[PDB]
Amino acid sequence: GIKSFKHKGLKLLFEKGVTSGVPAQDVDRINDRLQAIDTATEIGELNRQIYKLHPLKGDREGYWSITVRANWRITFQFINGDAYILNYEDYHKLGPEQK
């Protein structure tokens, strides 16, 4: 299950259905991916091809990334069947050394 959030917009959406902190047109896709992360019992279950699951590097080693749309990612730690530090971020703001 998802156990913590860094990004308040994702947290509001997941915990309360409040949509104001994510793009309106991405609400459904983000909800679908949050539910997938929440259901996953191992990082393999999130390995649907359309998600382009990627481990990050450097100070982001220990984080995983999946694609929402274009350059937008949901990132998280995944361990012992749970996900932590859920964030919504722009891939292009990661440095080359981080991905």
Residues 2-21 touching Cl ion, rule: CB under 5 A, are 4-5, 8-9, 11, 21
- For residues 24 and 96, which CB has a smaller minimum distance to Cl ion in the complex? 24
Both tokens of 50, joined, read: 């359309």
CB 28 to Cl ion: min, Å: 18
Please report whether residue 85 would count as binding Cl ion according to CB under 5 A: no
Print burial letters for 57-79: b (CB count within 10 Å at least 16), e (below 16): eeebeebbbbbbeeebbbbbebe
Complete DSSP assignment for 48-78: -GGG--EE--GGGTT-EEEEEETTEEEEEEE
- For residues 90 and 95, which CB has a smaller minimum distance to Cl ion in the complex? 90
- Kindly name the residue from 92, 93, 96, 97 that is annotated as catalytic: 92
Q: Which of 19, 36, 38, 43 binds Cl ion (CB under 5 A)?
A: 43
Q: Which of 1, 18, 42, 58 binds Cl ion (CB under 5 A)?
A: 42
Q: Active site includes 54? A: no
Enter the DSSP assignment of 85.
E
Half-sphere exposure of 46 (CA within 13 A, CB side): 32
Residues designated catalytic = 92
